[PDB]
């Protein structure tokens, strides 16, 4: 199965890849938000397999799938409704005010601003900090998808409020703390 960002993938639910990326051992899988799965939840994408490596939620809200079998990586994130896909080439952060796009498996590609970062948010399961505030809607099943700002990788799917009928806010995990903390290197 190849491992796109935004497809959809389940494991008692469902919630969507975030980016294809590798970890120290050099094993394919793919970051999503830790609200996803706890540690040693399975995981099916197509005729692929694999299981929470990482996870952490509350408090962040950050996960890493290790694929165990099927799993091809590429540097893709689906653009759904837009068509095609967006290219990943890094994850340079992006300036507040910069536009970016959210990838999700229920509503698809949608786009806004990202509003601020160092954000806390409750949910029902408790709060999670250091998050990034966007105008982006989302709606459940989006949940680990990602956010990209043209070719750079920003983030996965954590929450937020309203949906994407009326519009609503969102906000995002950051990525590079995933990647720096677990030691794995974002497919390029």
Same mark, same amino acid.
């Given at each position: %199965?190849?491992?796109?960002?935004?497809? !959809?993938?389940? =494991?008692?639910?469902?919630? *969507?890849?975030? $980016?294809? %990326?590798?970890? !120290?051992?050099?094993?394919?899988?793919?970051? @999503?938000?830790?609200?996803?799965?706890?540690?040693?939840?399975?995981?099916?994408?197509?005729?692929?397999?694999?299981?929470?490596?990482?996870?952490?939620?509350?408090?962040?809200? %950050?996960?890493?799938?290790?694929?165990?079998?099927?799993?091809? +990586?590429?540097?893709?994130?689906?653009?759904?409704? *837009?068509?095609?896909?967006?290219?990943?080439?890094?994850? *340079?952060? %992006?300036?507040?005010?910069?536009?970016?796009?959210? *990838?999700?498996? /229920?509503?698809?590609?949608?786009?806004?601003?990202?509003?601020? #970062?160092?954000?806390?948010?409750?949910?029902?399961?408790? /709060?999670?900090?250091?998050?990034? #505030?966007?105008?982006?809607?989302?709606?459940?099943?989006?949940?680990?998808?990602?956010?990209?700002?043209? /070719?750079? !990788?920003?983030?996965? @799917?954590?929450?937020?409020?309203?949906?994407? #009928?009326?519009?609503?806010?969102? $906000?995002?995990?950051?990525?590079?703390? =995933?990647?720096?903390?677990?030691?794995? #290197? +974002?497919?390029?």
């Amino acid at each position: %199965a190849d491992i796109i960002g935004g497809l !959809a993938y389940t =494991m008692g639910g469902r919630c *969507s890849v975030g $980016f294809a %990326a590798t970890n !120290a051992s050099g094993q394919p899988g793919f970051v @999503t938000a830790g609200h996803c799965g706890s540690v040693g939840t399975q995981v099916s994408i197509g005729n692929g397999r694999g299981v929470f490596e990482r996870s952490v939620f509350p408090g962040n809200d %950050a996960a890493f799938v290790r694929g165990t079998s099927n799993f091809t +990586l590429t540097n893709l994130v689906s653009r759904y409704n *837009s068509g095609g896909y967006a290219t990943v080439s890094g994850s *340079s952060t %992006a300036p507040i005010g910069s536009q970016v796009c959210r *990838s999700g498996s /229920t509503t698809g590609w949608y786009c806004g601003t990202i509003q601020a #970062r160092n954000q806390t948010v409750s949910y029902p399961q408790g /709060t999670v900090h250091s998050l990034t #505030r966007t105008s982006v809607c989302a709606e459940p099943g989006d949940s680990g998808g990602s956010f990209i700002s043209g /070719t750079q !990788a920003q983030g996965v @799917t954590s929450g937020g409020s309203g949906n994407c #009928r009326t519009g609503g806010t969102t $906000f995002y995990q950051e990525v590079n703390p =995933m990647l720096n903390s677990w030691n794995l #290197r +974002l497919r390029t």
